[PDB]
Design an enzyme around this catalytic site. Sequence first.
Site, PDB file in Angstrom:
ATOM      1  N   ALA A 178       0.728  -1.200   0.041  1.00  0.00           N
ATOM      2  CA  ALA A 178      -0.048  -0.129   0.095  1.00  0.00           C
ATOM      3  C   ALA A 178       0.799   1.311   0.103  1.00  0.00           C
ATOM      4  O   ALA A 178       0.293   2.414  -0.250  1.00  0.00           O
ATOM      5  CB  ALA A 178      -1.148  -0.122   1.250  1.00  0.00           C
ATOM      6  N   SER A 179       2.053   1.160   0.211  1.00  0.00           N
ATOM      7  CA  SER A 179       3.073   2.219   0.257  1.00  0.00           C
ATOM      8  C   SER A 179       3.839   2.481  -1.066  1.00  0.00           C
ATOM      9  O   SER A 179       4.593   3.080  -0.975  1.00  0.00           O
ATOM     10  CB  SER A 179       4.081   1.963   1.568  1.00  0.00           C
ATOM     11  OG  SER A 179       3.551   1.910   2.797  1.00  0.00           O
TER      12      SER A 179
ATOM     13  N   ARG B 277       7.990   6.219  15.924  1.00  0.00           N
ATOM     14  CA  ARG B 277       7.105   5.297  16.270  1.00  0.00           C
ATOM     15  C   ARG B 277       7.494   3.807  16.058  1.00  0.00           C
ATOM     16  O   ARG B 277       6.868   2.855  16.099  1.00  0.00           O
ATOM     17  CB  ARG B 277       5.670   5.648  15.714  1.00  0.00           C
ATOM     18  CG  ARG B 277       4.838   6.563  16.221  1.00  0.00           C
ATOM     19  CD  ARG B 277       3.464   6.803  15.227  1.00  0.00           C
ATOM     20  NE  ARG B 277       2.923   8.103  15.710  1.00  0.00           N
ATOM     21  CZ  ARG B 277       3.144   9.439  15.446  1.00  0.00           C
ATOM     22  NH1 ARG B 277       4.148   9.604  14.390  1.00  0.00           N
ATOM     23  NH2 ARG B 277       2.767  10.322  16.020  1.00  0.00           N
TER      24      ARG B 277
END
Lengths: 351, 351
Positions: free
Chosen positions: B96-97, B204
């Site tokens: 999806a990236s 993150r």
Amino acid sequence: VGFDAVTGEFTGMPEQWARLLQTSNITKLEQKKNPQAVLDVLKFYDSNTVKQKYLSFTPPEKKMTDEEIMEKLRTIVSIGDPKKKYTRYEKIGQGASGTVFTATDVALGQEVAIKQINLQKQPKKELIINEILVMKELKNPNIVNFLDSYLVGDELFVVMEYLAGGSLTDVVTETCMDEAQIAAVCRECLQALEFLHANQVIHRNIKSDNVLLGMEGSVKLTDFGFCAQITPVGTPYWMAPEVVTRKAYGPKVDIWSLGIMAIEMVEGEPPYLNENPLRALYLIATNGTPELQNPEKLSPIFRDFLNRCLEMDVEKRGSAKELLQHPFLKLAKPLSSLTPLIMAAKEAMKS
Amino acid sequence: VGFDAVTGEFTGMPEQWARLLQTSNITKLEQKKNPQAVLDVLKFYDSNTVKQKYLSFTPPEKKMTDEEIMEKLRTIVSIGDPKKKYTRYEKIGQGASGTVFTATDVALGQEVAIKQINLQKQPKKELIINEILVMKELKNPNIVNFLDSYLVGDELFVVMEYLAGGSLTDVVTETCMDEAQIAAVCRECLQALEFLHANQVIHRNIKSDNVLLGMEGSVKLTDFGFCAQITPVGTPYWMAPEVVTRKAYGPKVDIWSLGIMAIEMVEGEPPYLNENPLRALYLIATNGTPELQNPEKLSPIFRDFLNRCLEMDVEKRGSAKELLQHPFLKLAKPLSSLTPLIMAAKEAMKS
């Protein structure tokens, strides 16, 4: 510079022009009767510049950075893959004008021509992009119009309209057009020329090779600019006497070329077919009109149209607006009348 | 909602959470001693959003047309062929990236990562382009920086920095880092985090997989945004207790993750390796720090650094600016000391 009438020698000619004249197959008598013309055609033939034209200025009048290119391309480039939107790619040309392809738009089913420009290698990037910007607003049904563009790396894909009926050359070489068909084609070409002239463009290359036909008889011109140069050395049979004179010239050279093409539509081949190019230029300069195969076969009203196109006096030569009103065009059949000639020509190619 | 202490039953739990808890391998006693934690980790595990982040706003603070795309791409797109400027293409990811490649710049000899985004298919075009615009001004040597971009049809090629030394994971799994090497790597990662935090970015995902090494020991982080997501389901071992609590959290989660990674550099594998993911989340929530393999082997000053990173109280947990001044980092060797570990790791892969 000078000429001695009894010896038949030109005085003080440059190296190249003395050299050319010997290969010209122009006679000593022909040099005698028209000494100025011979010098004019020798100069013209020696020049021989490719002389590429580019349309400039999108509004009524008509060392570069990646960011300036992307600025210019703002209104022209679509976000799409040209390898998915078009199929049946065939390479039809390559050279200084980019590589050129025909292809078919998958969604519409319509044939297109795709010109591929290498932005990094190509000189005069700004002119080409400026021409596309013109082409977006310079729209007419009797020319090939700009459809779309795509950026693929350093390669700009310019997509132009195209037609599947072939060139007018294919139809005249393989079939016999009647005068009502010739009137129909001349009317369409004059409508195009009227539009081009109204927008300060001289085509410069009206010949049956640059006349593209659709299957239902639609007619479009090509090879007027850079982008529309989508069709692929010898005799320039279509050129008016002013051009080969190396005089200044105007839009009525396109009218001369249209007349030459109307003769081609009758005889089924261009004039000067087996001539020496220098002799052909000489003949254009002195005689203008090449002598017809069998002129009694044509109607007087067609011979009239041919005369008004092939007048050597530019003032007497007709304008496109004028010839649109000429009685010959009233003989014109529906464009669908070309459909059987096109199909016949297509199945006659056999190559 | 509630819990009955003697039976050991939660009251009024949703369908999914009753279902998850049975598969969790959390004990009735463990549910008893920390009932709130169990509900927190069940909720967290049920959420499971991919939760893609995008950097926004190029200046200090940090249904779309082809023309608007070409506007946005003005300052980012180079006119060049990515198939000629880079070689040794290898596909390292897809999803999806975008699709992701490593490659080598022909002229410089340097490895790069190339992310390929389909502008037509990709949702949130504006966010991705906005991130690139951020990445052009968001420059630091301990992150992978934006190098270049190319438009290839509807496909945008984003080129990021890359390094040929592999990941930190390869070095820790195949070699034994001494504390002076670990200090060197921690200092580089804290320099990156200090920069990211100064620019309002929480990474993150600090883990050794996202730490990229150069051959001479250069250190860069990856996977902080969309564009830098250039490395390719199980236990999120690196997450701080606030995250899995589903409390609000700040930049000091990156500090927790750095501590977890410093443990990985010692033990040669991530924690919770064979755990049930739900039990692992439970253990992070209640215990925080997983119990060490053999803690006497470490120096007190390293154990101190580990404590200040892996403090469960966010106020007591260190900041990146603070830990940059911690005495452990003074043990740090030259980064070239990593070169033999990297070469050893590279020749140990044998796959």
